[PDB]
Design a protein around this ligand. Structure first.
Ligand SMILES: C=C(C)CCOP(=O)(O)OP(=O)(O)O
Lengths: 191, 191
């Protein structure tokens, strides 16, 4: 209880709770956004969607509906028993159509999981993470002004990863990515 | 380059720069504190020194000359190629005379290196770290109010470790521990 309590108090001293919903107009055509816009699944094949400019056509990504240009913000994501996921932030100006490698140099700050047990930060090169207990819920923490993106196990307060401090260019968006077709959705925790 | 600049801007924006000097009165008798109080080495054998109450008698530890009871503070330590070292903060009330495990529950928040290649956080139990580039200079970051102790590579800005947010009791001192005889001293970088 003490580690959860200190995690709650820290998030109150410093970070504004963001109420993040998924924008279906940004979602790759293989993704399904839930009607309440909190949950994400994958289809067996691309669905028939317009190719509007905001849509990720290659990467299996979706954005939030609000961006950040300043300030300290957090949100929490129920990854549950998923075997695969990536979450974090990206710049408004990322390449959405052509492939680009999802790295900080290309405007992406994400961590995640592959093959049930391989936790990685998508630094370049990728950082192999050591996680003592697989997180069911992950907190994403942004400080725009200091260039900080960090990740915690939201249930026990343990730290997962902090990217090197950087300089952002333009607005940042919450980003979510799933590659697999598996029973458990990715779900955003309401603020 | 940019990662060093962003690390510099972050530490300047949010943390008070501590000018840390070693207190030889606190040092375990096997330690040698330099005349300028910036450098720490180990002697071959325990020196004959008085067992005054403030002196560490069991652990091979020394404190700084100033504690923190509030605020955000940072300092940097040149570890160079030294194969063994642990650094961080501890509570004024730690057990200095008798055997105790150096853990957060016992008032110590430290990380470091064993046998040239084994990075650990001194959590209970110890957390094995994976560090892609061995740091030569380590930044120690304290936020008293949010219970935060984190550690960075002070040359490239890469993150090393963040303890779970906690609650501190009383003053925190910079603490330094070396177990081995090695050519390379630990040296505190001035503010
Ligand atoms: C033996 C002493 C007094 C120094 C190291 O203590 P431990 O052997 O308990 O090891 P750490 O895990 O604290 O390095």
């Amino acid at each position: 209880g003490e580690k959860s309590q200190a995690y709650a108090e820290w998030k109150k001293a410093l970070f504004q709770p963001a109420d993040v919903i998924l924008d279906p107009n940004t979602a790759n055509p293989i993704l399904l956004v839930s009607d309440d816009q909190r949950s994400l699944q994958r289809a067996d094949e691309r669905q028939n969607l317009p190719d509007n400019p905001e849509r990720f056509d290659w990467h299996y990504c979706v954005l939030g509906c609000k961006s950040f240009t300043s300030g300290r913000h957090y949100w929490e994501v129920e990854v549950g028993d998923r075997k695969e996921w990536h979450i974090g932030v990206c710049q408004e100006n990322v390449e959405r159509k052509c492939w680009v490698k999802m790295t900080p140099e290309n405007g992406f700050w994400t961590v995640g999981l592959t093959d049930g047990s391989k936790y990685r930060a998508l630094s370049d090169p990728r950082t192999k993470l050591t996680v003592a207990n697989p997180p069911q819920r992950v907190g994403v923490f942004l400080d725009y002004e200091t260039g900080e993106v960090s990740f915690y196990n939201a249930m026990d307060g343990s730290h997962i990863y902090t990217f090197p401090h950087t300089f952002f260019s333009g607005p940042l968006w919450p980003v979510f990515r799933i590659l697999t077709l598996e029973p458990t959705a990715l779900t955003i925790c309401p603020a």
